[PDB]
Ligand binder design. Structure first.
Ligand code: MG
Length: 289
């Protein structure tokens, strides 16, 4: 339908907007991809001379990536989630953003076990992630009752459908894909989760606005040199170094009038911004007690 078409154009538009991060080398290949292919073709024994040539090419690719990244500034990007709705589209838009293997798997595919460890704020109530000494079942029961009560203020309400959206198995792959579309370069720059000091500051927020349930899930990701590529090049590999930090806000809206009318719900939205209104929301979420 039109929702799916809009989503695909949003993934294409993201990859096109930052395509300067994925420029091919002088020999027409992405340099990191060339390194990995030669490591395979040379049976893990790249001779010393080719290794130096490759390290020189990779130095230049990393310099170009950094200059291109700077040239993008810090604008807020937006796209739809929904990658599972069109595997062929997302694989096509991820070309050059991550490995061919990871692109092939991206389109292809929940709370009972994950929700207890997720801290989440429902309305005005902060609900902790379970501690080892606490009943996970009781943590779950409190979360589902608070969810239900937000709407009552069980079987008839979409409690599970909303709470599924704060489970990492639902949002985390989609957020990683968004950051890859924008900032990845296959074989050279990879996306991973950032080290968060206070997990509770990143707790998702669930709110009731009129007849709409709004789920907001914040996260932060790092851009790093591709560790396999750097290890194959016999380079100094500091796994803690980052080329940048990227803030992401995932927003899912369940319209309760559409739910009972059986009408189509909107796809989740993803907002993305390189660290130096996503920023306003980040500051509203981090300030919660
Ligand atoms: Mg472009």
């Amino acid at each position: 339908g039109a929702m799916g078409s809009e989503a695909v154009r949003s993934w294409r538009g993201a990859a096109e907007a930052t395509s300067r991060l994925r420029e091919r080398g002088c020999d027409g290949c992405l340099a990191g991809i060339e390194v990995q292919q030669l490591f395979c073709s040379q049976s893990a024994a790249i001779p010393e001379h080719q290794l130096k040539e490759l390290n020189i090419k990779i130095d230049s690719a990393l310099q170009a990536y950094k200059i291109a990244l700077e040239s993008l500034g810090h604008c807020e990007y937006a796209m739809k989630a929904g990658f599972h709705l069109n595997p062929k589209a997302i694989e096509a838009s991820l070309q050059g953003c991550c490995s061919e293997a990871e692109a092939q798997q991206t389109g292809r595919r929940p709370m009972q076990c994950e929700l207890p460890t997720v801290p989440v704020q429902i309305g005005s109530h902060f609900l902790k992630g379970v501690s080892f000494n606490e009943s996970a079942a009781d943590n779950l029961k409190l979360k589902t009752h608070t969810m239900l009560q937000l709407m009552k203020e069980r079987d008839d309400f979409p409690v599970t459908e909303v709470l599924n959206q704060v489970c990492p198995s639902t949002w985390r792959g989609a957020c990683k894909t968004a950051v890859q579309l924008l900032f990845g370069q296959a074989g050279l720059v990879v996306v991973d989760t950032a080290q968060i000091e206070n997990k509770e500051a990143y707790a998702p927020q669930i709110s009731l606005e009129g007849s709409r349930i709004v789920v907001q899930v914040p996260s932060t990701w790092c851009l790093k040199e591709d560790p396999a590529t750097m290890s194959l090049l016999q380079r100094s590999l500091d796994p803690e170094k980052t080329l940048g930090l990227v803030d992401v806000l995932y927003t899912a809206v369940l319209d309760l009038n559409r739910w009972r009318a059986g009408r189509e719900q909107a796809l989740p939205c993803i907002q993305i911004q390189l660290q130096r209104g996503l920023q306003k929301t980040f500051s509203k979420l981090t300030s919660r007690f």
